């Protein structure tokens, strides 16, 4: 087995559905995954579970919940309801956390403070149901470039502020793509450790040049992130969970055979990632 | 006159050289500019000065200095030397500040902490010459997406930390494109005010979607930034200097007649920008 490696299934999403991805992962000695809700829906929740169990599969996360801002309270309630259903799916599959991607500005608002208030309210509204189901909520801070239209939780400091306020049952998914640049990263990781808030660690690389804002994530080692440096900090902070490969690569990795992608992931994980 | 408006000449860089840009600005009632060092070099420093003086032109900034990291001390010294020459140009033209864009990772380094140390060292090395010439150094924090390859000063908090440490003669250029997303923006602006560190304010907009990482800045009002909200904070912090339009728009504004761009800038400034 490749111990301590997980594959977020977005990494081979062009190539595979849920059943085939799991098959390819188990064949390469990988026994931990993070599936997406649409992948689960395509195979069916009952079959997804059967597969999880038949291998006692570790799910490092379910992607994703969140998307809280909306112009009206009823739209915000509709989002809260979707998150409760997401929690239920995570529980059924035994996921280590439900990943939350906050949502950006609602409608045509320029009020980012208000959108952020909506996100905190939504997480607060979902948290009782998530605590009750045994599903930790992982706020994934997203890269600042995504603030307007994808997620207005944009720093680890901000995400940890929300955690500290709401209390137990909410933590952070630390994705290197989203946080590597942060000048206060070392402090916030140590802070997350002391709060016991680290729920997941996602890996990939920042390419130079980066050629697309969303779908040009690098394979570990092809970019400029000090991955080992970051992993060492995360472990020193007390998180020893699996490193989860999440690569969106429209023009490279999504065009290669899935077996080549997963094998490269094993190779890079051993050479570039371990702390 | 359009009081309180400045045009960073990058906004019409495809259309105009220095002499023609100034002509177009003065014709639309704009009497403040921020030229680039290559534009000054193309017209010649002596002629640039003659033009500045013939109108008593306000320069809200000179773009740019910085670019401090390099793999070797001699490369770092070469950068420091270039910055001293940049200071001299700013002095000669009577610029309100020399804008500093930090530089990204040197060579093939993954050590962003070290590159940041190099930037602080470089600013520290240039500062005596800049103090002596009467040229304030404006650290311009750049958007986090630029961290690897353009500038590893990426938050207003980080930039103000450097200012506070080095002391007098170094402040911040606050560009809305670079900082609008920052969850601690309100606090850091108030902080910059208390330190008396605000040297410039650059305006433009964040488009949704943004279609290019470098050259798809919006015209004020076409995007999602609360420009008036930010300007009000800057004024409450005690900076009442000109708002400087800096737009890099490869597929829109750089393809329009310069007169139409500058007229739109006046229109939006009056409608969308004033606090
Ligand atoms: Zn992630
Ligand atoms: Zn700027």
List, as one string, the DSSP characters of A161-185: HHHHHH-TTEEEEEEHHHHTT-TTH
Residue indicated by tokens 């403040």: B32
Instruction: Please name the helix (run of DSSP H) or strand (run of DSSP E) that holds residue A261, with its range, or none.
Output: helix A258-268
Q: Dihedral sign for Cα B5, B8, B9, B10, please.
A: negative
Distance separating alpha carbons of residues A52 and A55, to the nearest angstrom: 6
Q: Spell out where chain A has E strands.
A: 5-8, 32-34, 58-59, 62-66, 98-101, 137-139, 170-175, 198-203, 243-245
Specify the 3-state DSSP secondary structure of A12. helix
Closest CA to A151 of A218, A104, A93: A104
What CATH number did the domain enclosing A242 receive? 3.20.20.150
Task: Phi first, then psi: give them for residue B200, nearest 5 degrees.
Answer: -160, 160
Domain with A83 in it: 1-275
Report the largest interatomic distance among the alpha carbons of chain B, rounded to a whole angstrom.
49
Nearest to A8 by CA among A217, A272, A171, A155: A217
Q: How far apart (Å, rounded) are the C-alpha atoms in residues A64 and A35? A: 9
B219, B206 contact by CB (below 8 A): no
On chain A, the residues whose CB falls within 8 A of the CB of B210 are 145, 148, 213
Tokens standing for B31?
A: 């009497």
Chain-centre distance of CA A181, in angstroms? 18
Q: H or E segment at A18?
A: helix A18-27
For residue A31, give how far its alpha carbon lies from the nearest alpha carbon of chain B (Å).
Answer: 30
Contact at 8 Å (CB) between A204 and A217? yes
**Contact at 8 Å (CB) between B157 and B132?**
no
**Helices (runs of H) and strands (runs of E) counted in chain A:** 10, 9
CB distance A143–B147 less than 8 Å? Answer: no
Neighbouring residues of the ion ligand 2, judged by CB less than 5 Å: B 175, 202, 246
Q: In 3D, which of B140, B226, B146 has the Cα closest to residue B180?
A: B226
CA-to-CA separations, B197 to A212, A258, B64, B240, in angstroms, rounded: 35, 53, 18, 13
ω into B202 cis (within 30 of 0): no
Q: Which tokens is A216 given?
A: 């040009």
The residues, ordered by sequence, that sit 6+ positions from B251 with a Cβ below 8 Å of its Cβ are B211, B212, B215, B216
Backbone angles phi, psi at B98, to 5 degrees: -95, 120
A104, with CB counted inside 10 A (0-12, 13-18, 19+), is buried
Give the C-alpha distances (Å, rounded to integers) separating A80 from A100, A102, A121, A163, A199. Answer: 12, 12, 9, 18, 21
DSSP string, A76-105: HHHHHHHHHHHHHHHHHHTBS-EEEE-B--
3-state secondary structure of B164: helix
Indicate which of A103, A144, A232 best probes the interface with B, i.e. most B CBs within 10 Å of its own CB: A144
Which strands form B5-8's sheet, in the order they lie side by side?
B58-59, B32-34, B5-8, B243-245, B198-203, B170-175, B137-139, B98-101, B62-66
Contact list in A for residue B225 (CB cut-off 8 A) is 110
- The structure's method of determination equals X-ray
Give the full edge-to-edge strand order of the sheet including A98-101. Answer: A58-59, A32-34, A5-8, A243-245, A198-203, A170-175, A137-139, A98-101, A62-66
Q: What is the DSSP letter of B218?
A: B
Report how many domains make up chain A: 1
**Residues contacting residue B202 through CB under 8 Å, at least 6 positions apart:** B8, B140, B173, B174, B175, B176, B177, B243, B244, B245, B246
d(CA A253, CA A237): 32
């Amino acid at each position: 087995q490749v111990e301590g490696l997980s594959i977020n299934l977005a990494t081979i999403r062009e190539q595979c559905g849920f059943a085939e991805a799991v098959d390819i992962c188990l064949k390469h000695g990988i026994t931990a995954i993070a599936p997406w809700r649409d992948q689960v829906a395509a195979i069916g929740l009952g079959e997804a579970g059967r597969i999880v169990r038949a291998n006692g599969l570790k799910l490092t996360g379910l992607c994703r919940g969140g998307f809280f801002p909306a112009p009206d309270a009823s739209g915000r309630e509709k989002a809260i309801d979707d998150n409760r259903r997401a929690v239920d799916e995570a529980a059924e599959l035994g996921a280590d956390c439900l990943v939350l991607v906050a949502g950006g500005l609602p409608g045509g608002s320029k009020n980012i403070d208000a959108a952020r208030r909506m996100v905190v309210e939504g997480i607060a509204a979902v948290l009782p149901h998530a605590r009750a189901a045994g599903v930790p909520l992982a706020i994934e801070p997203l890269h600042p470039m995504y603030a307007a239209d994808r997620a207005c939780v944009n720093t680890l400091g901000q995400a940890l502020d929300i955690c500290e306020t709401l209390g137990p049952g909410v933590g952070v998914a630390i994705d290197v793509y989203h946080v590597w640049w942060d000048p206060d990263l070392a402090n916030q990781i140590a802070r997350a450790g002391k709060m016991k808030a680290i729920l997941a660690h996602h890996i990939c690389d920042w390419l130079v040049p980066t050629k697309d804002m969303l779908t040009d994530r690098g394979m570990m080692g092809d970019g400029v992130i000090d991955l080992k440096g970051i992993r060492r900090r995360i472990e020193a902070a007390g998180f020893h969970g699996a490193q989860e490969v999440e690569i969106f690569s429209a023009d490279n990795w999504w065009k290669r055979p899935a077996d080549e992608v997963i094998a490269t992931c094993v190779e890079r994980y051993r050479n570039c990632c371990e702390g």
